Amino acid sequence: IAQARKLVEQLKMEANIDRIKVSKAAADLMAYCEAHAKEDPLLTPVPASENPFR
Amino acid sequence: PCPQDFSLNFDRAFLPALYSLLFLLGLLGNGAVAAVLLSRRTALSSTDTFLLHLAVADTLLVLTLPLWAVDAAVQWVFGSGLCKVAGALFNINFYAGALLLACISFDRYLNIVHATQLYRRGPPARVTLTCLAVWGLCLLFALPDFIFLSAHHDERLNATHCQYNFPQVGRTALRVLQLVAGFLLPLLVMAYCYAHILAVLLVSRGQRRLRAMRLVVVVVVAFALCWTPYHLVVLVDILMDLGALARNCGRESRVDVAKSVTSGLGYMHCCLNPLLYAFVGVKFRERMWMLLLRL
Amino acid sequence: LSAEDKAAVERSKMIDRNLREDGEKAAREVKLLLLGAGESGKSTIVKQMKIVKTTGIVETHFTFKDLHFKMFDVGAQRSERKKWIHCFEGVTAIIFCVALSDEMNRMHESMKLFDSICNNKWFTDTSIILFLNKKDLFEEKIKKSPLTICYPEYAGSNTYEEAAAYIQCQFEDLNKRKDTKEIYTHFTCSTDTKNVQFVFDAVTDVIIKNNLKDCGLF
Amino acid sequence: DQLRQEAEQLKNQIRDARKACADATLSQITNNIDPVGRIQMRTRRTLRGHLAKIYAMHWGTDSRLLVSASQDGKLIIWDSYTTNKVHAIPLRSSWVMTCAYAPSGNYVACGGLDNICSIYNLKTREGNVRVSRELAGHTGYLSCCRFLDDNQIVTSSGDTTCALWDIETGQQTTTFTGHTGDVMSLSLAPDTRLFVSGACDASAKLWDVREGMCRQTFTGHESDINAICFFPNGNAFATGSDDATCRLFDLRADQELMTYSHDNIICGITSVSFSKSGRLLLAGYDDFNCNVWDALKADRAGVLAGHDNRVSCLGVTDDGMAVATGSWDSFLKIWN
Amino acid sequence: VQLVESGGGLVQPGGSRKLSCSASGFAFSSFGMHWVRQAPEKGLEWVAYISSGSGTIYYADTVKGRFTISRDDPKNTLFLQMTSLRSEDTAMYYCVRSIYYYGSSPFDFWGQGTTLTVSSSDIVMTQATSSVPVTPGESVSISCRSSKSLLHSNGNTYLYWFLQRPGQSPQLLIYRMSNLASGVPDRFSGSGSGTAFTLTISRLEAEDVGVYYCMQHLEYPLTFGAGTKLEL
Ligand SMILES: N=C(N)NCCC[C@H](NC(=O)[C@@H]1Cc2ccccc2CN1C(=O)CCC(=O)c1ccccc1)C(=O)NCC1CCCCC1
Ligand SMILES: CC(C)CCC[C@@H](C)[C@H]1CC[C@H]2[C@@H]3CC=C4C[C@@H](O)CC[C@]4(C)[C@H]3CC[C@]12C
Ligand SMILES: CC(C)CCC[C@@H](C)[C@H]1CC[C@H]2[C@@H]3CC=C4C[C@@H](O)CC[C@]4(C)[C@H]3CC[C@]12C
């Protein structure tokens, strides 16, 4: 009877939080990927002059 | 007096086709074996390294073959110094093949008969030492061919095939060396080692013992039957030079044609051994397929 | 090029040499994975060895005829066996212990474990040494109780020999890969030397067959 | 026995609340973004010296030194630029399944089938690496371990628990419970105030380092979750499981955002990591190679092949210059 | 950790001696070892180096041929067998450990030194200043100059700063021109470029006086240059 009460309390604490629309989170992820695109050596390779590996 | 006309015609009509076929098959098979084993050298066992050396030796021998094919075809047109290295390479490869067969047999004997004793305290570098000793011995044996081969032009039957030039005592000594080492030493070593391997495999129980027994017997009998007739003809020639010679226009002709056909059989065995040693192994087939689907 | 990087490279090369030597030393030792169902005589087999602090895995080293064996006991894990069994893919052999004196359907659980272990995708061509302990208790119980209580299909006498042979056949019939792997059976006796000698013989056979596979003779 | 009704009611309410927020979809939002190019990555370096399966690796914070753990009982510290072996540590237990490298670089950690997390001090006056600590208290194998601030470490175990330790004293500061199956991996948030643990119950949980509580639980997988990582922003994370699909969830919307799967791929996933900007997703598979996915379009952007066995560990440097992958064939490869 | 020297004394010219250096408290097998020499009232002068595992051995040009360095690792001892002793070999000999990997600090620990008395180098580094009068409330700058660019193609400038207090053995202050050694107060700092380098002390105390040396570790002759004296 302890496990059921603990589980129910956990579900309460998980349900009480506030959420955000999926479109807003998608826009935020898109904006973060866009802003830091220039600083990604794996996405846009840098010339061999400043490449530590070869 | 009957200057080997029939034997010469037989050689001209027979040698080039057989040597071309042996060249093609030997290159294909031995190069396949060398490519499979050369992709990943880190996981090479003892017998795998010995097999790689044997594949290299057979490849080089079958590469050397077409020069002697065209030598036998009409007449040797190349440089008089070119076959002084062609024949040396040929002899090196012949002795290397024989000694590496013996070494494969000895390694298999060690892995199976002395399995526990070699597992517990087996040396970690004896394979390379054995291979280098074999190659050094082959160079030592090939030195006589390296410094006594030349190309002299006899007035009769104007042409120039290149061969040896030393007293007949030297010819007998070279023939005895060739016979004793190349045939008897691998034959005795393989016989002893594989007899002990068979004695060990008799008492064991399982399904992976009958295939091993079959492969052992197949390898031994194949080598024996492929390389006995040529040395029989060599013995006949040695006896003939030391008396008991008829030369009734047919004896030398028959001896020469027999020597040619048995040499062809020997090179057939040289081209045939990667089938015996590599493509029957489950591990080798697995690695070959792994390479094939990787590329 | 390299000013004091040559000393770094030399240190790296000495590290490589020591690593190679340690690997060579470790490659001349035998690996056994000890498995059982609910501590069914595993300790007694372990006691034959002569040579809360830890609860994950137990090591047991011994030497027989100059050969060094290391046995790994993983009986105190109680977690998903499928999440760490692949760590033991390269062990030389498995040693499966089964108590013959079985009471609540324990032989069925032992067979389920044996089926899950022998037919595992990681333990192909890995040999299993099956120990059947408690032969005297089996004698007494089979004198008292019949084997039909565990096997309704059994249609033999209550003799020790027939019952033991039937149990051994029932265990060995769970091996699907009858060709690429072999099962060695031994009814454990009180003598200490006999168990170690049987393990040594089985390991010698396993080494021989592995060498045949590596030599190309199969 | 009457509380299951309330649990079902709360679960249904949570599901409906998650349903109400799904006003759009990431794919139909980002379809207008031009796709990233076909990616070729070249193997700059190959590190040799491990004689058994490599089970874990971790990068240094300088993005030059890395540590690798292999079940030959070895920890090796490599200088990736020159492929030099800085240190070689022999472990008491050969059964190592994880390793970590401290953010300061002073210590390393390892663990495995011995249920003990061993912490080694690299910078000693005696010139040798010696065991600094052995944290014990887990009743199952260690699956992962991550250093927080050079004095406390978070570990996950196969006894369905996680624990935050105190290296100075050796005592479990906090114990995180609530998973049903073994916890296979954890990922540390960039601010080190939260972390996510993925378990074998096909669930992921977001634990708060303080208060020792689970804040959110994410489902959607169909098999054991083997790998987990955070988005660089720290507001989303990605998981890989045994059903051959990666998933991308977000913390704020409290539900799945995207799935990465292909009809050809059927084997499980061992490692998952992002890129520096978060546009790429590196995933290691059991079919002997690695896949680079577009994190915003769910289309495979590249393949990293060249490992002869299962790719078990995978990491991306802090500066994002290179990707190091290690497999069961006992080799690590640097890609760029 | 300590290095203890033995074998000094008075020797006639042309004789032979063997200096011993016993090491306790550290893994002697992992450290390369150097013998350094300091003539009476003169600067430091590198003499010999033996690698770890006795792989590579280097000698100074002025002592090559008549000196021999060796190590015995089971007993943790370092020997310098010197022969044909001239009158210019009277000095104090120091035994120095140095371990090399990525991010290490060679030359960190120096022995006490043994005195040996005898009766009757393409990179030169100049410390032009010889003495400086200071008070324990200011900041002091010591300049060192090289004849070659100490900066290497891998971004590492190989300059080391050592401090020798009166009556003691030199201790590592800075390695590779920027990094402070372990157990060194933060007030010390180092900088420079290629050929001109500077050591800076923010606020001195009574224990900041002594002789400062700038060694190079680019080419192996390992020249030192006469130090700069700070007193009062
Ligand atoms: N007088 C000449 N030129 N040769 C006549 C017959 C020589 C005969 N060869 C052969 O029978 C056949 C066929 C043949 C026929 C006529 C001419 C040449 C050949 C070439 N052959 C070979 O099989 C190649 C022989 C060879 O490669 C070689 C090596 C060293 C010195 C000389 C030749 C031979 O002695 N072979 C050498 C043997 C070397 C070891 C065993 C295998 C053969
Ligand atoms: C291991 C050692 C023997 C290396 C072998 C390579 C040397 C010795 C070989 C390879 C090429 C050979 C030469 C090739 C061509 C000729 C021209 C000929 O009219 C006389 C012999 C002569 C001059 C050969 C002598 C031996 C030779 C120089
Ligand atoms: C003209 C004469 C002197 C040339 C004959 C010598 C040549 C053919 C021989 C001598 C030494 C031999 C090599 C010795 C060792 C190895 C390593 C092995 O893993 C592959 C074969 C290989 C690479 C051999 C190839 C053939 C070889 C190069």
Side-chain angles (χ1 to χ4, degrees):
Chain A
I1 208 163
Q3 69 276 16
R5 214 173 312 265
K6 294 301 291 183
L7 175 73
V8 161
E9 199 277 4
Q10 170 58 40
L11 273 296
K12 285 184 170 69
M13 295 298 102
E14 185 164 339
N16 71 4
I17 70 168
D18 46 354
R19 307 181 159 72
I20 290 173
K21 295 262 172 313
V22 162
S23 63
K24 183 161 183 211
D28 296 359
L29 287 197
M30 182 179 72
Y32 183 86
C33 282
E34 183 178 1
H36 294 236
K38 299 298 293 295
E39 305 172 355
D40 201 334
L42 299 173
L43 206 59
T44 61
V46 296
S49 66
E50 67 272 17
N51 192 2
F53 310 90
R54 296 294 86 193
Chain B
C2 301
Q4 314 99 37
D5 202 350
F6 152 75
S7 72
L8 185 62
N9 281 58
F10 177 84
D11 291 331
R12 287 180 179 176
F14 171 62
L15 269 295
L18 163 79
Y19 280 20
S20 64
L21 160 72
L22 293 183
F23 171 89
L24 183 63
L25 273 182
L27 276 296
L28 188 153
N30 296 281
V33 165
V36 170
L37 301 178
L38 259 180
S39 80
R40 44 180 291 169
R41 281 82 65 193
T42 55
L44 277 196
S45 62
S46 302
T47 306
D48 278 353
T49 302
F50 281 125
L51 182 55
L52 168 62
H53 283 260
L54 185 57
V56 166
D58 291 331
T59 300
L60 295 200
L61 196 144
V62 292
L63 294 174
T64 313
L65 215 56
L67 269 71
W68 314 107
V70 67
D71 182 341
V74 64
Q75 58 100 21
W76 169 275
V77 298
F78 292 164
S80 175
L82 180 53
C83 72
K84 289 180 69 67
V85 67
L89 187 69
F90 199 84
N91 290 12
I92 284 160
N93 296 171
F94 178 76
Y95 295 124
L99 295 193
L100 286 161
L101 283 188
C103 285
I104 286 185
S105 172
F106 183 62
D107 165 60
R108 289 184 174 175
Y109 163 86
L110 270 189
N111 276 8
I112 302 165
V113 182
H114 305 298
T116 293
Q117 188 274 151
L118 181 90
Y119 179 85
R120 162 187 66 241
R121 62 180 178 88
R126 55 161 197 88
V127 182
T128 50
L129 296 180
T130 306
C131 291
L132 268 298
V134 165
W135 283 111
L137 268 176
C138 294
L139 287 167
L140 188 67
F141 293 126
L143 280 191
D145 188 13
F146 195 79
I147 62 170
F148 274 61
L149 208 70
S150 68
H152 54 75
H153 164 224
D154 62 358
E155 63 178 2
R156 51 167 302 279
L157 190 72
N158 285 136
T160 307
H161 323 113
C162 70
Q163 68 250 31
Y164 301 89
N165 52 346
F166 40 75
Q168 291 304 117
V169 177
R171 257 180 200 175
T172 299
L174 189 143
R175 274 178 221 282
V176 176
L177 187 153
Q178 201 163 72
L179 183 141
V180 175
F183 189 56
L184 266 70
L185 183 63
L187 196 68
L188 289 176
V189 169
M190 293 177 71
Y192 178 84
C193 297
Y194 277 127
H196 277 266
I197 292 174
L198 273 173
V200 168
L201 281 175
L202 279 169
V203 308
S204 72
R205 299 141 283 272
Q207 293 82 17
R208 311 155 60 154
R209 88 179 165 101
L210 307 165
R211 194 158 137 77
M213 293 174 135
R214 286 178 229 277
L215 274 165
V216 161
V217 174
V218 160
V219 166
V220 173
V221 74
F223 178 80
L225 70 87
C226 290
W227 269 120
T228 299
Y230 170 73
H231 294 109
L232 288 179
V233 186
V234 168
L235 281 168
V236 175
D237 186 25
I238 290 172
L239 274 296
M240 167 190 138
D241 279 331
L242 275 71
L245 156 64
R247 192 63 178 88
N248 306 329
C249 285
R251 162 148 288 172
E252 182 182 345
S253 170
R254 290 169 280 163
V255 167
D256 178 313
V257 300
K259 192 177 288 185
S260 181
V261 299
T262 61
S263 305
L265 188 46
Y267 313 135
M268 185 66 204
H269 165 256
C270 282
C271 295
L272 180 66
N273 75 7
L275 183 63
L276 288 173
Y277 282 94
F279 295 140
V280 305
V282 160
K283 199 188 165 192
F284 183 87
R285 283 193 315 226
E286 190 270 353
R287 277 192 290 176
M288 171 202 54
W289 282 339
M290 182 179 72
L291 175 144
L292 190 61
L293 294 201
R294 155 184 155 179
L295 263 50
Chain C
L1 290 177
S2 302
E4 68 181 59
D5 311 338
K6 298 178 182 160
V9 172
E10 172 175 359
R11 162 188 185 88
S12 175
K13 269 152 54 208
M14 293 177 71
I15 291 186
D16 289 332
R17 187 178 302 120
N18 278 72
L19 263 61
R20 191 197 63 231
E21 289 189 6
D22 291 303
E24 281 172 3
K25 174 182 169 67
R28 283 83 58 85
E29 293 179 353
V30 185
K31 280 73 176 175
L32 308 169
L33 166 62
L34 177 66
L35 279 150
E39 194 175 0
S40 42
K42 279 169 56 167
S43 64
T44 309
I45 299 313
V46 172
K47 294 181 176 67
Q48 318 295 332
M49 183 278 288
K50 274 81 68 178
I51 193 66
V52 71
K53 178 170 65 72
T54 184
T55 187
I57 183 177
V58 192
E59 294 293 328
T60 314
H61 289 208
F62 57 96
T63 45
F64 199 67
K65 286 182 175 46
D66 303 338
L67 199 50
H68 195 96
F69 304 90
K70 304 177 307 217
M71 185 162 48
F72 316 109
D73 175 30
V74 292
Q77 276 295 119
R78 300 162 288 108
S79 66
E80 294 293 328
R81 185 156 31 78
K82 69 182 291 293
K83 279 313 187 175
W84 49 262
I85 204 79
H86 46 70
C87 311
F88 299 92
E89 206 194 343
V91 289
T92 293
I94 304 181
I95 299 190
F96 206 92
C97 296
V98 169
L100 271 182
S101 50
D102 279 324
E103 176 57 73
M104 65 182 179
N105 64 51
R106 277 192 160 127
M107 209 81 63
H108 285 195
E109 214 62 26
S110 279
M111 294 172 185
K112 286 183 181 179
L113 185 40
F114 191 89
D115 198 12
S116 169
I117 280 298
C118 194
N119 300 312
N120 201 358
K121 67 168 176 179
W122 303 115
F123 294 144
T124 43
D125 59 74
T126 293
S127 301
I128 295 192
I129 292 149
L130 179 67
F131 278 117
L132 291 152
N133 316 296
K134 297 167 194 327
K135 60 193 291 185
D136 51 355
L137 282 72
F138 185 65
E139 189 79 52
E140 293 179 353
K141 289 185 179 181
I142 204 67
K143 214 164 309 189
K144 293 187 286 185
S145 176
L147 198 46
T148 290
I149 190 167
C150 185
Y151 312 89
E153 190 276 331
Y154 187 39
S157 72
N158 263 341
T159 301
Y160 163 79
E161 275 75 12
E162 322 201 306
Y166 182 70
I167 287 187
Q168 158 169 358
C169 289
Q170 264 300 303
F171 269 97
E172 294 210 15
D173 279 22
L174 295 161
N175 178 21
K176 262 74 153 174
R177 308 142 159 82
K178 287 283 185 67
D179 63 358
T180 179
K181 78 205 283 166
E182 188 176 358
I183 298 188
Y184 308 87
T185 308
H186 179 79
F187 292 79
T188 299
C189 63
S190 177
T191 300
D192 48 4
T193 54
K194 297 296 273 299
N195 293 156
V196 188
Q197 183 67 48
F198 180 82
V199 165
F200 184 81
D201 287 338
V203 166
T204 306
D205 194 56
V206 170
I207 291 162
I208 288 192
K209 288 183 170 62
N210 266 326
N211 286 337
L212 276 69
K213 185 175 180 180
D214 283 331
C215 282
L217 278 186
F218 157 73
Chain D
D1 58 357
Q2 72 276 16
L3 283 174
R4 287 146 157 90
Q5 180 150 330
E6 174 95 9
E8 184 185 3
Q9 183 273 294
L10 272 160
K11 169 61 206 161
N12 262 337
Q13 166 207 359
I14 288 184
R15 180 186 47 81
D16 285 357
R18 285 180 220 227
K19 176 71 55 63
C21 288
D23 74 274
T25 292
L26 179 47
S27 76
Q28 65 183 357
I29 280 182
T30 51
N31 65 345
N32 282 313
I33 283 174
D34 62 358
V36 308
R38 187 268 298 164
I39 304 286
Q40 311 270 159
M41 276 185 182
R42 179 66 179 86
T43 299
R44 313 309 212 187
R45 276 92 166 95
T46 294
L47 321 165
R48 319 169 204 269
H50 273 315
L51 297 173
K53 303 154 147 190
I54 295 170
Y55 269 67
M57 62 96 62
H58 201 208
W59 274 102
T61 199
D62 53 17
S63 64
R64 162 156 195 179
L65 299 153
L66 72 165
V67 58
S68 80
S70 175
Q71 278 190 346
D72 60 334
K74 286 289 182 179
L75 278 173
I76 303 186
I77 296 195
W78 319 79
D79 186 74
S80 44
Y81 288 8
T82 78
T83 67
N84 275 335
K85 282 189 199 52
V86 190
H87 290 113
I89 298 100
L91 316 171
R92 281 75 178 272
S93 187
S94 170
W95 312 106
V96 54
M97 281 191 312
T98 192
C99 73
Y101 193 80
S104 42
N106 300 317
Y107 313 83
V108 300
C110 70
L113 277 157
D114 58 355
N115 310 350
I116 292 169
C117 189
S118 311
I119 285 147
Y120 300 72
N121 187 19
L122 298 177
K123 290 157 190 337
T124 58
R125 193 85 178 154
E126 293 95 38
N128 55 1
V129 178
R130 61 166 140 76
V131 189
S132 172
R133 193 60 63 183
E134 293 179 353
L135 312 162
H138 272 318
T139 56
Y141 55 87
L142 270 292
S143 299
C144 194
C145 56
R146 280 318 185 239
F147 270 100
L148 287 170
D149 60 9
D150 198 75
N151 193 67
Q152 53 196 356
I153 187 181
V154 190
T155 56
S156 73
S157 187
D159 66 344
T160 80
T161 49
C162 310
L164 189 151
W165 300 83
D166 190 78
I167 303 174
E168 193 183 299
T169 75
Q171 303 301 130
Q172 266 185 14
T173 298
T174 314
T175 303
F176 306 92
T177 64
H179 271 304
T180 301
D182 311 346
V183 186
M184 290 276 102
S185 72
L186 54 85
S187 185
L188 208 67
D191 60 355
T192 67
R193 298 281 290 171
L194 300 166
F195 69 102
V196 289
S197 65
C200 284
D201 49 29
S203 76
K205 291 187 183 293
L206 171 74
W207 314 94
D208 190 359
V209 168
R210 273 71 173 173
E211 292 99 13
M213 67 183 181
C214 177
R215 295 179 66 250
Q216 297 160 234
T217 305
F218 307 93
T219 68
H221 270 293
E222 283 151 41
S223 295
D224 292 331
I225 302 179
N226 296 328
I228 203 161
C229 184
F230 281 98
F231 200 65
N233 197 12
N235 283 317
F237 68 93
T239 70
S241 68
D242 269 7
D243 65 9
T245 74
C246 291
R247 318 291 186 113
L248 177 74
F249 315 82
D250 54 25
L251 306 191
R252 286 187 296 183
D254 207 307
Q255 65 183 357
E256 186 150 38
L257 280 181
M258 185 179 288
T259 187
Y260 313 97
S261 85
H262 198 272
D263 308 67
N264 177 323
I265 297 154
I266 62 170
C267 63
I269 304 174
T270 53
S271 298
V272 165
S273 78
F274 272 101
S275 178
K276 184 169 176 63
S277 54
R279 186 54 185 277
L280 298 189
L281 180 59
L282 277 294
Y285 293 83
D286 298 333
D287 61 357
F288 297 171
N289 65 341
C290 173
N291 285 7
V292 189
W293 300 83
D294 191 343
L296 294 185
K297 311 217 81 185
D299 74 87
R300 174 134 44 99
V303 176
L304 274 43
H307 277 296
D308 291 331
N309 209 323
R310 158 185 308 198
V311 170
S312 66
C313 48
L314 185 144
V316 176
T317 69
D318 291 331
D319 57 356
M321 224 63 84
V323 185
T325 77
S327 44
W328 282 8
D329 65 9
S330 78
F331 293 116
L332 296 99
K333 286 181 168 62
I334 311 291
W335 309 75
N336 198 359
Chain E
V1 59
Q2 65 182 357
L3 281 298
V4 171
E5 279 101 4
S6 291
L10 183 63
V11 176
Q12 315 300 327
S16 304
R17 298 286 277 171
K18 182 174 72 68
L19 302 193
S20 296
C21 167
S22 177
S24 68
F26 67 98
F28 183 85
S29 303
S30 294
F31 285 76
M33 293 264 150
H34 303 259
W35 280 98
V36 185
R37 168 170 64 225
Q38 185 178 52
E41 217 57 37
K42 298 293 183 182
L44 298 169
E45 164 155 335
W46 179 71
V47 165
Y49 160 71
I50 185 170
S51 175
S52 80
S54 302
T56 76
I57 303 191
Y58 289 109
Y59 299 98
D61 186 74
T62 187
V63 306
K64 185 183 287 185
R66 57 186 174 94
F67 278 50
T68 300
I69 192 176
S70 53
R71 64 198 314 171
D72 173 68
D73 287 333
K75 292 177 71 68
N76 288 348
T77 312
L78 184 80
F79 312 105
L80 183 67
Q81 178 67 69
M82 64 184 73
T83 58
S84 308
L85 286 168
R86 300 172 185 173
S87 179
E88 78 205 66
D89 294 6
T90 181
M92 208 181 301
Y93 283 69
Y94 303 103
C95 189
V96 187
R97 63 175 201 162
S98 83
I99 192 170
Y100 305 97
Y101 45 87
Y102 173 71
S104 68
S105 77
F107 286 87
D108 58 357
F109 202 86
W110 291 55
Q112 296 294 321
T114 198
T115 318
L116 185 139
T117 306
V118 171
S119 313
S120 172
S121 167
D122 275 335
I123 302 194
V124 65
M125 309 199 48
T126 65
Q127 272 162 285
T129 299
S130 278
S131 197
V132 170
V134 298
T135 185
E138 67 208 7
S139 70
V140 179
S141 161
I142 293 145
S143 66
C144 185
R145 214 169 65 269
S146 176
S147 71
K148 256 181 54 62
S149 189
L150 287 188
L151 195 144
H152 200 266
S153 81
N154 53 50
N156 262 322
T157 316
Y158 293 110
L159 180 79
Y160 295 65
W161 282 98
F162 306 99
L163 162 67
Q164 166 157 44
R165 281 181 204 97
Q168 308 206 32
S169 47
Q171 74 168 2
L172 182 72
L173 284 194
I174 277 175
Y175 55 102
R176 281 182 224 99
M177 174 215 96
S178 284
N179 311 102
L180 292 174
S182 187
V184 168
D186 186 74
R187 69 161 159 283
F188 288 100
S189 298
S191 86
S193 70
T195 306
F197 318 91
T198 300
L199 176 72
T200 317
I201 313 165
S202 66
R203 39 190 51 87
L204 290 58
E205 300 168 68
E207 70 161 8
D208 284 20
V209 299
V211 191
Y212 290 77
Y213 300 92
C214 52
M215 186 199 75
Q216 65 105 22
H217 213 308
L218 189 66
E219 316 280 356
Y220 210 78
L222 264 67
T223 55
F224 264 90
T228 286
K229 180 73 176 69
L230 269 72
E231 69 275 16
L232 196 145

